[PDB]
DNA sequence: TATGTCCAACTTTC
DNA sequence: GAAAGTTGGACATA
DNA sequence: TATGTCCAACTTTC
DNA sequence: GAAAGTTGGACATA
């Protein structure tokens, strides 16, 4: 069945999302990027809110794909990558991710989508912690689920300060802080 | 009656503070603050460059007042003091916290508020550093890192958890928040 | 206010 | 019945 | 609307 | 009488 038209529109939304952010994700812009009439967008999606939400989730999934293709030499390093990869190709995705966090306060649809990405992120960290524990590399004094929420909280809070302009919390300090908490949570 | 410049400014600032806590930034209009202070609307710009300056400075004062409340909590130890400065469950602080959250978001579109929010983070950090240094000197805290690094990580944990908590995450409620904060304090200062 | 922007429903055309 | 075209007002903002 | 900005007249203090 | 402080509104603007 020719579901390619829906995927064509979706991929247009993904590209507009990464290039212009949520502000640029109008029916007209997406339709132009997809090369279709504006009527077809509603013909394949209930509303623009659904499209923006689904397209945002697709972008976050692509981000996680990009993070996973980086192979590391240990579960410690794979956890750091999953929580704070330095790969520059993730920057456009992280930018959209931050915008969704802000819009979540006023948009319930984006809030729902944003909440899902947190769970997808949490699940990823949980899988890595459980594997490293079974490998004998990680020592667990607490549940993987609890450890993962604290590490994600550490990253989000530290990133909230980083974006402000703190010279004391730059990319270098971010790395050292993340490595330090991994040491405390999983190597004690 | 008539007041000197410093006194008049404080009356306007005090009104701006109570409006912020009662109605948030949205309620902090020139006329609403001036009426709350009992002064002519023009008095605001006689004593502040702009409403943006007034909002930012008043916001800072509110956060300061919050930090005063927490600091006078009469704790029984440096651990309890640090927990209070990071995650006090005192219900009196909630109106201050809601304004704090509001400023974090507005900082994305308002440089004045962003600069003011930046200051509150430093003020918060300064207090955490002092408590950590005090507990270390008192023999209560064990430090494997500088108090400055420890403080930023504890503050980041709090800010990060609060963001998740605000989302409605059932696995991260008020009880979990406390447990997580108490647990990281153990890792950082008692390991 | 009122002005720019945007969209889900409606209308016409084929 | 489907695509193309039009509407009216919602929404945020000058 | 309603909200920010600014000022010429007015009132109090010196 | 001058200086300081205050007022209400005009005007433009988010």
Author numbering:
A (entry chain B): 5 to 192
B (entry chain A): 2 to 192
Article sentences:
We previously identified EilR as a regulatory component of a multidrug efflux system from Enterobacter lignolyticus, a bacterium isolated from the soil of a Puerto Rican rainforest because of its ability to catabolize lignin components. In its native context, EilR regulates expression of EilA, an inner membrane transporter that confers tolerance to imidazolium-based ionic liquids, reagents that enhance the microbial conversion of lignocellulosic biomass to chemicals. EilR belongs to the TetR family of transcription factors, which commonly regulate divergently transcribed adjacent genes. Amino acid residues 1–192 of each monomer form 9 α-helices arranged in two domains: the N-terminal DNA-binding domain consists of residues 1–52, forming three α-helices, and the C-terminal ligand-binding domain comprises residues 53–192, forming six α-helices.
Using X-ray crystallographic analysis, we determined the structure of the repressor in complex with the consensus operator DNA, and found that EilR binds as a homodimer. While EilR establishes non-specific DNA contacts through hydrogen bonding with the DNA sugar-phosphate backbone and a salt bridge with a phosphate group, three residues are responsible for the specific binding of EilR to its DNA operator: Residues Arg32 and His47 in the HTH domain establish direct contacts with two nucleotide bases in the eilO major groove. Unlike other characterized members of the TetR family, EilR also specifically interacts with a base located in the minor groove, established by residue Tyr3. Arg32 and His47 substitutions completely impaired operator binding, while the decreased operator affinity of the Tyr3 mutant indicates that this interaction in the minor groove is important for binding specificity. Out of the inexhaustible resource for genetic parts found in microbes, we made use of the multidrug efflux regulator EilR from a rainforest bacterium as the key component of this system. This repressor not only recognizes the major groove of its operator DNA like other members of the TetR-family, but it also establishes additional interactions with a base in the minor groove that result in increased DNA affinity and specificity. In particular, we observed that eilOc binds with high affinity to EilR, exceeding that of the native E. lignolyticus operators. Comparison of EilR in its induced and DNA-bound forms showed a significant conformational change around the ligand-binding sites. A small difference in the positions of the DNA-binding domains of the EilR dimer was observed between the induced and DNA-bound states.
